[PDB]
Amino acid sequence: IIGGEFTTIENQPWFAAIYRRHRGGSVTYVCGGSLISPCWVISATHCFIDYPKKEDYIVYLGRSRLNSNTQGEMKFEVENLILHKDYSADTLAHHNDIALLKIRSKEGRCAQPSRTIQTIALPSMYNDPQFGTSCEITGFGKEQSTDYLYPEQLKMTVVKLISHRECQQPHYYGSEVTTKMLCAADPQWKTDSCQGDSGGPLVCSLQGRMTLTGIVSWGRGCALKDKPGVYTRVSHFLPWIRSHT
Numbered sequence: 101i102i103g104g105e106f107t108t109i110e111n112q113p114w115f116a117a118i119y120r121r122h123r124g125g126s127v128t129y130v131c132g133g134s135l136i137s138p139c140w141v142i143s144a145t146h147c148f149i150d151y152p153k154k155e156d157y158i159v160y161l162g163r164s165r166l167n168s169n170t171q172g173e174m175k176f177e178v179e180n181l182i183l184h185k186d187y188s189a190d191t192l193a194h195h196n197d198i199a200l201l202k203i204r205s206k207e208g209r210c211a212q213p214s215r216t217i218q219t220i221a222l223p224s225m226y227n228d229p230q231f232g233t234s235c236e237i238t239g240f241g242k243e244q245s246t247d248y249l250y251p252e253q254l255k256m257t258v259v260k261l262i263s264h265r266e267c268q269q270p271h272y273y274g275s276e277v278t279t280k281m282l283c284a285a286d287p288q289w290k291t292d293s294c295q296g297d298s299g300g301p302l303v304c305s306l307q308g309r310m311t312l313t314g315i316v317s318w319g320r321g322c323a324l325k326d327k328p329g330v331y332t333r334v335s336h337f338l339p340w341i342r343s344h345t
């Protein structure tokens with residue numbers, strides 16, 4: 101996350117942390133995710149396509165830190181990895197950039213909800229918030245685009261939604277953005293998502309309850325003028341989600 105503020109998992113308990121085994125014992129961070137249901141985490145597809153085998157992957161919950169074991173956390177293996185059949189990578193864009201992970205532990209159980217671990221609700225269909233709505237992104241992504249490293253502590257920030265009409269501008273993303281994608285940004289372009297945040301949530305409060313409006317997907321440089329963050333428009337993928345569960 102570019103700018104923003106640090107946080108713990110108690111502020112964003114649905115947040116999930118996805119790591120991949122090696123290939124010689126090493127365990128590196130891959131992407132974020134959101135627990136939508138006890139056995140189901142949702143992520144982005146582009147996160148896994150290079151190494152799309154579930155046995156490679158580990159998923160932790162109730163984890164506020166990157167390489168340090170947070171108290172109250174739970175570790176999970178991927179029982180099933182479900183990438184979106186119609187996915188495609190444009191040079192910049194990622195189409196249908198949405199993934200489902202079925203989680204289970206070594207004891208073969210899903211999550212137990214705790215103070216540090218809780219599900220996020222999904223929108224009602226096609227029911228997105230008004231543009232300019234302040235909305236919340238979370239992840240262990242780069243603090244600045246020049247950084248090699250990801251931050252050790254979890255971060256979150258605020259971004260305001262942008263109408264499609266607006267994001268369609270050639271000045272912005274031109275053609276690249278579709279209506280299954282959302283844009284968001286800080287009016288100053290001061291804070292943003294970045295690499296490593298991908299798969300992580302975009303949670304707007306809608307109808308007096310918090311709601312998973314988007315999944316961090318792509319962007320040209322973290323936090324640059326006239327280049328918002330682009331997120332998978334979750335309201336648009338509800339049947340796919342529903343079915344694949």
Ligand SMILES: COc1ncc(-c2nc(C(=O)NC(=N)N)c(N)nc2N2CCCCCC2)cn1
Pocket residue numbers: 245292293294295296297298316317318319320321322323327328329330
């Ligand atoms: C040159 O610097 C630079 N570094 C990283 C990225 C990048 N950004 C995002 C991202 O979420 N961006 C955003 N919300 N603005 C994102 N989700 N993924 C990113 N990448 C991940 C590595 C694979 C190649 C694409 C870049 C772009 N530019």
